Amino acid sequence: FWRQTWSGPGTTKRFPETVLARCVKYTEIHPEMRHVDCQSVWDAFKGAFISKHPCDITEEDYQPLMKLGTQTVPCNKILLWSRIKDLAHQFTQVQRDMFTLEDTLLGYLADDLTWCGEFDTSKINYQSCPDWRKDCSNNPVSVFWKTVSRRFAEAACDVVHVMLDGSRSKIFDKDSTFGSVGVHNLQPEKVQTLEAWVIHGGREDSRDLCQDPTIKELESIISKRNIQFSCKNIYRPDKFLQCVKNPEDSSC
Ligand SMILES: N=c1c2ncn3c2ncn1[C@@H]1O[C@H](COP(=O)(O)OP(=O)(O)OC[C@H]2O[C@@H]3[C@H](O)[C@H]2O)[C@@H](O)[C@H]1O
């Protein structure tokens, strides 16, 4: 109890009951998924990582789950995001202008959770789970988010939007899942433009962050894939959200 196996937090308490109840809820609300069998979804999710070493997980381990969670989303309304979850979710909640990964069945099931098992027993590990940095990259949580993020980016078309945190020292981070998976899995045959919205964390009057070194790097990577790049500053995110709710406001 004074020294755990792995360096990451253990599985979320009641993980199996939580995933099953989220599936039931999502399928009650979204009519395109109203026929999914949630017991079958749980069995497939559990099959990906139970009795498997938690540093030896592959994208193939998640394929039965991917197949059951098959879902179409409007290809021209996708919002990617990195390190700014709260604003992305508050925005799409107003009137469903765009869709993030947590708007899909699989993203909704896993958001805010942690899970892992152990080799050659069928027990869930509630005490610790591998850290991506210290222990291993090929862990149950990291491999899941890479697999679903690649499929979501592959689905996009027309104009795709990305929200970025302009308070971080790498506004665009090549090492983030957006930078290592999303940028490279947009399909140039389908996607016309990537538009970044750089969210300010600061005061009021501040710099044009669309000139930031890392934003110029993103522009060069995307342009060399034969996709156009656009960038917009959101100086005051509080005012932005208000204008989405109430656009007749004079101040907009
Ligand atoms: N919803 C979550 C989530 N909820 C909790 N976590 C999530 N990871 C990814 N996702 C989604 O995957 C995307 C890719 O994640 P990444 O940017 O690598 O998370 P990072 O900012 O690198 O952080 C990933 C970490 O945050 C925990 C995971 O346990 C853990 O692995 C996120 O933008 C988000 O859409």
mmCIF file of C-alpha atoms and ligand atoms in Angstrom:
data_model
loop_
_atom_site.group_PDB
_atom_site.id
_atom_site.type_symbol
_atom_site.label_atom_id
_atom_site.label_comp_id
_atom_site.label_asym_id
_atom_site.label_seq_id
_atom_site.Cartn_x
_atom_site.Cartn_y
_atom_site.Cartn_z
ATOM 1 C CA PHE A 1 0.000 0.000 0.000
ATOM 2 C CA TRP A 2 3.055 2.287 0.295
ATOM 3 C CA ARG A 3 4.418 1.414 -3.158
ATOM 4 C CA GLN A 4 2.255 0.665 -6.246
ATOM 5 C CA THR A 5 3.201 -1.372 -9.373
ATOM 6 C CA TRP A 6 2.730 1.470 -11.904
ATOM 7 C CA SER A 7 3.181 5.234 -11.846
ATOM 8 C CA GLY A 8 -0.347 6.244 -13.058
ATOM 9 C CA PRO A 9 -3.694 6.479 -11.124
ATOM 10 C CA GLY A 10 -5.668 3.121 -10.862
ATOM 11 C CA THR A 11 -8.993 2.302 -12.655
ATOM 12 C CA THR A 12 -11.960 4.592 -11.873
ATOM 13 C CA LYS A 13 -14.168 3.131 -9.081
ATOM 14 C CA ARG A 14 -17.235 1.235 -10.421
ATOM 15 C CA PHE A 15 -15.782 1.399 -13.979
ATOM 16 C CA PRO A 16 -17.978 -1.441 -15.417
ATOM 17 C CA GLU A 17 -21.259 -0.075 -14.042
ATOM 18 C CA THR A 18 -20.302 3.468 -15.161
ATOM 19 C CA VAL A 19 -19.573 2.469 -18.755
ATOM 20 C CA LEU A 20 -22.799 0.399 -18.974
ATOM 21 C CA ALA A 21 -24.954 3.267 -17.608
ATOM 22 C CA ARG A 22 -23.340 5.791 -19.969
ATOM 23 C CA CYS A 23 -24.124 3.509 -22.938
ATOM 24 C CA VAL A 24 -27.800 3.161 -21.798
ATOM 25 C CA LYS A 25 -28.102 6.947 -21.453
ATOM 26 C CA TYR A 26 -26.405 7.817 -24.770
ATOM 27 C CA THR A 27 -28.596 5.292 -26.647
ATOM 28 C CA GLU A 28 -31.852 6.671 -24.993
ATOM 29 C CA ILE A 29 -31.035 10.200 -26.184
ATOM 30 C CA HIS A 30 -29.530 9.654 -29.707
ATOM 31 C CA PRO A 31 -32.002 7.937 -32.002
ATOM 32 C CA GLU A 32 -29.410 6.754 -34.585
ATOM 33 C CA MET A 33 -27.917 4.598 -31.790
ATOM 34 C CA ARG A 34 -31.264 3.571 -30.185
ATOM 35 C CA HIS A 35 -30.785 -0.094 -31.168
ATOM 36 C CA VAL A 36 -27.169 -0.729 -29.932
ATOM 37 C CA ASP A 37 -26.917 -3.586 -27.365
ATOM 38 C CA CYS A 38 -25.032 -2.060 -24.406
ATOM 39 C CA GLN A 39 -24.141 -5.438 -22.841
ATOM 40 C CA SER A 40 -22.385 -6.336 -26.141
ATOM 41 C CA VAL A 41 -20.563 -2.947 -26.077
ATOM 42 C CA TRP A 42 -19.269 -3.571 -22.512
ATOM 43 C CA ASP A 43 -18.186 -7.131 -23.393
ATOM 44 C CA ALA A 44 -16.186 -5.750 -26.357
ATOM 45 C CA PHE A 45 -14.625 -2.910 -24.280
ATOM 46 C CA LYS A 46 -13.629 -5.363 -21.512
ATOM 47 C CA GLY A 47 -12.222 -7.817 -24.126
ATOM 48 C CA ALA A 48 -9.767 -5.167 -25.338
ATOM 49 C CA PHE A 49 -7.753 -5.058 -22.042
ATOM 50 C CA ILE A 50 -8.792 -7.819 -19.539
ATOM 51 C CA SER A 51 -6.186 -10.575 -19.076
ATOM 52 C CA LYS A 52 -3.720 -8.610 -21.261
ATOM 53 C CA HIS A 53 -0.431 -7.020 -20.106
ATOM 54 C CA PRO A 54 -1.186 -3.245 -19.778
ATOM 55 C CA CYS A 55 2.003 -2.312 -21.673
ATOM 56 C CA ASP A 56 1.131 -4.546 -24.651
ATOM 57 C CA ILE A 57 -2.199 -3.216 -25.983
ATOM 58 C CA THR A 58 -2.771 -2.684 -29.766
ATOM 59 C CA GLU A 59 -5.308 -0.847 -31.954
ATOM 60 C CA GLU A 60 -6.463 -4.364 -33.036
ATOM 61 C CA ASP A 61 -7.502 -5.100 -29.424
ATOM 62 C CA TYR A 62 -10.141 -2.300 -29.782
ATOM 63 C CA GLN A 63 -11.617 -3.379 -33.197
ATOM 64 C CA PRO A 64 -14.632 -5.373 -31.855
ATOM 65 C CA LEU A 65 -15.536 -2.216 -29.824
ATOM 66 C CA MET A 66 -14.951 0.069 -32.882
ATOM 67 C CA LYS A 67 -17.256 -2.109 -35.019
ATOM 68 C CA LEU A 68 -20.149 -2.033 -32.494
ATOM 69 C CA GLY A 69 -19.712 1.751 -31.980
ATOM 70 C CA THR A 70 -19.863 2.499 -35.772
ATOM 71 C CA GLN A 71 -21.562 5.930 -36.107
ATOM 72 C CA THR A 72 -21.836 8.602 -38.776
ATOM 73 C CA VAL A 73 -21.415 12.279 -37.809
ATOM 74 C CA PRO A 74 -21.953 15.285 -40.159
ATOM 75 C CA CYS A 75 -18.542 15.409 -41.908
ATOM 76 C CA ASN A 76 -18.538 19.165 -42.447
ATOM 77 C CA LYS A 77 -19.290 20.057 -38.771
ATOM 78 C CA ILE A 78 -16.308 18.572 -36.905
ATOM 79 C CA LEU A 79 -14.535 20.421 -34.075
ATOM 80 C CA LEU A 80 -11.114 19.129 -33.046
ATOM 81 C CA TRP A 81 -9.577 20.486 -29.863
ATOM 82 C CA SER A 82 -6.402 20.275 -27.822
ATOM 83 C CA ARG A 83 -6.014 21.060 -24.120
ATOM 84 C CA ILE A 84 -9.203 23.237 -23.974
ATOM 85 C CA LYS A 85 -12.060 20.752 -23.256
ATOM 86 C CA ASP A 86 -14.329 22.979 -21.205
ATOM 87 C CA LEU A 87 -14.815 25.724 -23.831
ATOM 88 C CA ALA A 88 -15.147 23.221 -26.700
ATOM 89 C CA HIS A 89 -17.944 21.350 -24.904
ATOM 90 C CA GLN A 90 -19.761 24.532 -23.674
ATOM 91 C CA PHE A 91 -19.763 25.850 -27.268
ATOM 92 C CA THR A 92 -21.218 22.686 -28.945
ATOM 93 C CA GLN A 93 -23.886 22.407 -26.158
ATOM 94 C CA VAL A 94 -25.631 25.721 -27.110
ATOM 95 C CA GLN A 95 -27.278 24.607 -30.397
ATOM 96 C CA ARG A 96 -25.108 21.718 -31.762
ATOM 97 C CA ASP A 97 -23.256 23.920 -34.306
ATOM 98 C CA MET A 98 -20.347 21.429 -34.365
ATOM 99 C CA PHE A 99 -19.521 17.932 -32.958
ATOM 100 C CA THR A 100 -16.462 16.907 -30.877
ATOM 101 C CA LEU A 101 -15.104 13.385 -30.174
ATOM 102 C CA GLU A 102 -17.098 13.345 -26.830
ATOM 103 C CA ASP A 103 -20.319 13.760 -28.883
ATOM 104 C CA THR A 104 -19.878 10.275 -30.327
ATOM 105 C CA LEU A 105 -20.899 7.096 -28.376
ATOM 106 C CA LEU A 106 -17.302 5.927 -27.838
ATOM 107 C CA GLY A 107 -15.888 9.332 -26.766
ATOM 108 C CA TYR A 108 -18.830 9.811 -24.361
ATOM 109 C CA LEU A 109 -18.262 6.298 -22.762
ATOM 110 C CA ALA A 110 -14.576 6.958 -21.935
ATOM 111 C CA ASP A 111 -14.372 10.733 -21.156
ATOM 112 C CA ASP A 112 -12.722 11.458 -17.728
ATOM 113 C CA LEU A 113 -12.075 7.731 -16.939
ATOM 114 C CA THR A 114 -8.963 5.502 -16.414
ATOM 115 C CA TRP A 115 -8.785 1.687 -16.783
ATOM 116 C CA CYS A 116 -6.322 -1.254 -16.948
ATOM 117 C CA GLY A 117 -6.024 -4.985 -16.233
ATOM 118 C CA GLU A 118 -3.215 -7.508 -15.666
ATOM 119 C CA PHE A 119 -1.590 -10.328 -17.585
ATOM 120 C CA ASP A 120 -3.064 -13.793 -16.991
ATOM 121 C CA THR A 121 -5.689 -12.821 -14.404
ATOM 122 C CA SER A 122 -9.133 -11.404 -15.294
ATOM 123 C CA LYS A 123 -9.034 -8.722 -12.544
ATOM 124 C CA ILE A 124 -9.352 -4.924 -13.091
ATOM 125 C CA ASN A 125 -6.481 -2.991 -11.460
ATOM 126 C CA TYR A 126 -8.007 -0.363 -9.156
ATOM 127 C CA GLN A 127 -4.660 0.423 -7.465
ATOM 128 C CA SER A 128 -2.448 1.712 -10.341
ATOM 129 C CA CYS A 129 -2.197 1.892 -14.143
ATOM 130 C CA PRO A 130 0.766 2.650 -16.476
ATOM 131 C CA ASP A 131 1.934 6.245 -16.987
ATOM 132 C CA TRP A 132 2.438 7.067 -20.715
ATOM 133 C CA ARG A 133 5.765 8.740 -19.950
ATOM 134 C CA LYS A 134 7.319 6.702 -17.137
ATOM 135 C CA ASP A 135 6.062 3.216 -17.911
ATOM 136 C CA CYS A 136 4.764 2.727 -21.495
ATOM 137 C CA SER A 137 2.904 4.302 -24.361
ATOM 138 C CA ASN A 138 1.040 1.130 -25.408
ATOM 139 C CA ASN A 139 -1.391 1.210 -22.416
ATOM 140 C CA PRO A 140 -5.198 0.671 -22.434
ATOM 141 C CA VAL A 141 -6.144 4.394 -22.113
ATOM 142 C CA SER A 142 -3.588 5.848 -24.524
ATOM 143 C CA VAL A 143 -4.162 3.274 -27.263
ATOM 144 C CA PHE A 144 -7.978 3.804 -27.022
ATOM 145 C CA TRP A 145 -7.738 7.571 -27.522
ATOM 146 C CA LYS A 146 -5.254 7.202 -30.417
ATOM 147 C CA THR A 147 -7.537 4.678 -32.189
ATOM 148 C CA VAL A 148 -10.782 6.714 -31.839
ATOM 149 C CA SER A 149 -9.008 10.047 -32.637
ATOM 150 C CA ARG A 150 -7.618 8.593 -35.954
ATOM 151 C CA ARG A 151 -11.129 7.387 -37.075
ATOM 152 C CA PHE A 152 -12.716 10.813 -36.122
ATOM 153 C CA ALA A 153 -10.161 12.773 -38.192
ATOM 154 C CA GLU A 154 -10.586 10.335 -41.146
ATOM 155 C CA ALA A 155 -14.349 11.120 -41.102
ATOM 156 C CA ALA A 156 -13.955 14.892 -41.615
ATOM 157 C CA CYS A 157 -14.660 16.847 -44.791
ATOM 158 C CA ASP A 158 -15.002 20.422 -46.173
ATOM 159 C CA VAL A 159 -13.983 23.012 -43.476
ATOM 160 C CA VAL A 160 -12.668 21.375 -40.214
ATOM 161 C CA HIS A 161 -12.182 23.557 -37.107
ATOM 162 C CA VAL A 162 -9.656 23.171 -34.201
ATOM 163 C CA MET A 163 -9.723 24.993 -30.824
ATOM 164 C CA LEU A 164 -6.186 25.575 -29.357
ATOM 165 C CA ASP A 165 -5.088 26.830 -25.917
ATOM 166 C CA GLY A 166 -3.173 30.119 -26.489
ATOM 167 C CA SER A 167 -2.030 30.256 -22.832
ATOM 168 C CA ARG A 168 0.304 27.160 -23.212
ATOM 169 C CA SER A 169 4.043 27.544 -24.274
ATOM 170 C CA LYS A 170 3.342 25.364 -27.350
ATOM 171 C CA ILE A 171 0.001 26.662 -28.692
ATOM 172 C CA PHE A 172 0.331 23.968 -31.350
ATOM 173 C CA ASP A 173 2.199 20.991 -29.886
ATOM 174 C CA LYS A 174 3.560 18.393 -32.389
ATOM 175 C CA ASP A 175 3.640 15.918 -29.543
ATOM 176 C CA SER A 176 -0.111 16.213 -28.637
ATOM 177 C CA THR A 177 -2.594 13.682 -30.089
ATOM 178 C CA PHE A 178 -3.901 16.559 -32.328
ATOM 179 C CA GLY A 179 -0.360 17.166 -33.639
ATOM 180 C CA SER A 180 0.753 13.508 -33.933
ATOM 181 C CA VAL A 181 -2.559 11.835 -35.062
ATOM 182 C CA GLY A 182 -5.230 14.354 -36.086
ATOM 183 C CA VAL A 183 -3.136 16.564 -38.454
ATOM 184 C CA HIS A 184 -1.830 13.488 -40.311
ATOM 185 C CA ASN A 185 -5.121 11.638 -40.681
ATOM 186 C CA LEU A 186 -7.281 14.414 -42.257
ATOM 187 C CA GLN A 187 -7.943 13.188 -45.822
ATOM 188 C CA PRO A 188 -6.784 15.749 -48.437
ATOM 189 C CA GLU A 189 -9.210 14.366 -51.111
ATOM 190 C CA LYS A 190 -12.157 15.465 -48.769
ATOM 191 C CA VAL A 191 -10.877 18.322 -46.564
ATOM 192 C CA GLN A 192 -10.687 21.807 -48.101
ATOM 193 C CA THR A 193 -9.515 23.868 -45.095
ATOM 194 C CA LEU A 194 -8.322 23.540 -41.476
ATOM 195 C CA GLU A 195 -9.370 26.656 -39.452
ATOM 196 C CA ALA A 196 -7.708 27.163 -36.003
ATOM 197 C CA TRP A 197 -9.322 29.228 -33.285
ATOM 198 C CA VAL A 198 -6.623 30.329 -30.853
ATOM 199 C CA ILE A 199 -8.248 30.869 -27.422
ATOM 200 C CA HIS A 200 -6.699 33.665 -25.287
ATOM 201 C CA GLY A 201 -6.279 33.021 -21.502
ATOM 202 C CA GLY A 202 -5.126 36.571 -20.852
ATOM 203 C CA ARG A 203 -6.448 40.004 -20.069
ATOM 204 C CA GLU A 204 -8.079 41.997 -22.817
ATOM 205 C CA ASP A 205 -5.780 43.684 -25.349
ATOM 206 C CA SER A 206 -3.049 41.186 -26.301
ATOM 207 C CA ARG A 207 -0.948 39.873 -29.212
ATOM 208 C CA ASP A 208 -1.976 38.415 -32.569
ATOM 209 C CA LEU A 209 -1.309 34.774 -31.574
ATOM 210 C CA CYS A 210 -1.971 33.620 -35.184
ATOM 211 C CA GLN A 211 1.642 34.819 -35.733
ATOM 212 C CA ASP A 212 3.108 32.496 -33.083
ATOM 213 C CA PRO A 213 6.060 30.314 -34.236
ATOM 214 C CA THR A 214 4.122 27.096 -33.581
ATOM 215 C CA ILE A 215 1.094 28.354 -35.598
ATOM 216 C CA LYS A 216 3.429 29.005 -38.566
ATOM 217 C CA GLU A 217 4.718 25.456 -38.177
ATOM 218 C CA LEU A 218 1.123 24.095 -38.256
ATOM 219 C CA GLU A 219 0.370 26.191 -41.356
ATOM 220 C CA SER A 220 3.430 24.757 -43.191
ATOM 221 C CA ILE A 221 2.590 21.108 -42.261
ATOM 222 C CA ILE A 222 -1.093 21.455 -43.374
ATOM 223 C CA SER A 223 -0.281 23.396 -46.613
ATOM 224 C CA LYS A 224 2.309 20.727 -47.640
ATOM 225 C CA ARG A 225 -0.518 18.112 -47.374
ATOM 226 C CA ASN A 226 -2.529 20.116 -50.017
ATOM 227 C CA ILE A 227 -5.015 21.470 -47.434
ATOM 228 C CA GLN A 228 -5.633 25.253 -46.947
ATOM 229 C CA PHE A 229 -4.978 26.811 -43.500
ATOM 230 C CA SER A 230 -6.874 29.691 -41.739
ATOM 231 C CA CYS A 231 -6.438 31.119 -38.195
ATOM 232 C CA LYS A 232 -8.652 33.369 -35.974
ATOM 233 C CA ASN A 233 -7.967 34.847 -32.488
ATOM 234 C CA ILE A 234 -10.685 34.566 -29.819
ATOM 235 C CA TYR A 235 -9.571 37.364 -27.478
ATOM 236 C CA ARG A 236 -12.343 37.088 -24.871
ATOM 237 C CA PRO A 237 -13.841 33.530 -24.638
ATOM 238 C CA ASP A 238 -16.528 34.747 -22.157
ATOM 239 C CA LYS A 239 -17.829 37.236 -24.748
ATOM 240 C CA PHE A 240 -17.606 34.610 -27.521
ATOM 241 C CA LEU A 241 -19.880 32.188 -25.629
ATOM 242 C CA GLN A 242 -22.370 34.941 -24.868
ATOM 243 C CA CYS A 243 -22.573 35.849 -28.556
ATOM 244 C CA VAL A 244 -23.226 32.174 -29.530
ATOM 245 C CA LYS A 245 -26.151 32.089 -27.038
ATOM 246 C CA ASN A 246 -27.464 35.586 -27.882
ATOM 247 C CA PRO A 247 -26.089 36.933 -31.173
ATOM 248 C CA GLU A 248 -28.532 39.855 -31.382
ATOM 249 C CA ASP A 249 -26.518 41.437 -28.488
ATOM 250 C CA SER A 250 -25.230 44.810 -29.765
ATOM 251 C CA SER A 251 -21.774 44.076 -28.346
ATOM 252 C CA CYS A 252 -21.331 41.209 -30.840
HETATM 253 N N1 LIG B 1 -11.711 13.006 -23.413
HETATM 254 C C1 LIG B 1 -10.442 12.662 -23.191
HETATM 255 C C2 LIG B 1 -9.955 12.384 -21.846
HETATM 256 N N2 LIG B 1 -10.597 12.444 -20.611
HETATM 257 C C3 LIG B 1 -9.659 12.183 -19.647
HETATM 258 N N3 LIG B 1 -8.443 11.908 -20.275
HETATM 259 C C4 LIG B 1 -8.596 12.065 -21.617
HETATM 260 N N4 LIG B 1 -7.751 11.895 -22.713
HETATM 261 C C5 LIG B 1 -8.216 12.112 -23.972
HETATM 262 N N5 LIG B 1 -9.588 12.420 -24.246
HETATM 263 C C6 LIG B 1 -9.961 12.939 -25.612
HETATM 264 O O1 LIG B 1 -8.915 12.459 -26.482
HETATM 265 C C7 LIG B 1 -8.227 13.561 -27.162
HETATM 266 C C8 LIG B 1 -6.739 13.268 -27.247
HETATM 267 O O2 LIG B 1 -6.141 13.359 -25.912
HETATM 268 P P1 LIG B 1 -4.760 14.072 -25.586
HETATM 269 O O3 LIG B 1 -4.855 15.563 -26.158
HETATM 270 O O4 LIG B 1 -3.636 13.124 -25.978
HETATM 271 O O5 LIG B 1 -4.890 14.126 -24.004
HETATM 272 P P2 LIG B 1 -3.661 14.642 -22.976
HETATM 273 O O6 LIG B 1 -3.922 16.161 -22.727
HETATM 274 O O7 LIG B 1 -2.288 14.195 -23.431
HETATM 275 O O8 LIG B 1 -4.150 13.855 -21.659
HETATM 276 C C9 LIG B 1 -4.609 12.519 -21.702
HETATM 277 C C10 LIG B 1 -4.991 12.177 -20.274
HETATM 278 O O9 LIG B 1 -6.340 12.718 -19.860
HETATM 279 C C11 LIG B 1 -7.219 11.606 -19.522
HETATM 280 C C12 LIG B 1 -6.563 10.348 -19.935
HETATM 281 O O10 LIG B 1 -6.670 9.508 -18.831
HETATM 282 C C13 LIG B 1 -5.108 10.681 -19.949
HETATM 283 O O11 LIG B 1 -4.295 9.695 -20.721
HETATM 284 C C14 LIG B 1 -8.568 14.756 -26.287
HETATM 285 O O12 LIG B 1 -8.487 16.056 -27.009
HETATM 286 C C15 LIG B 1 -9.965 14.434 -25.821
HETATM 287 O O13 LIG B 1 -10.835 14.629 -27.008
#
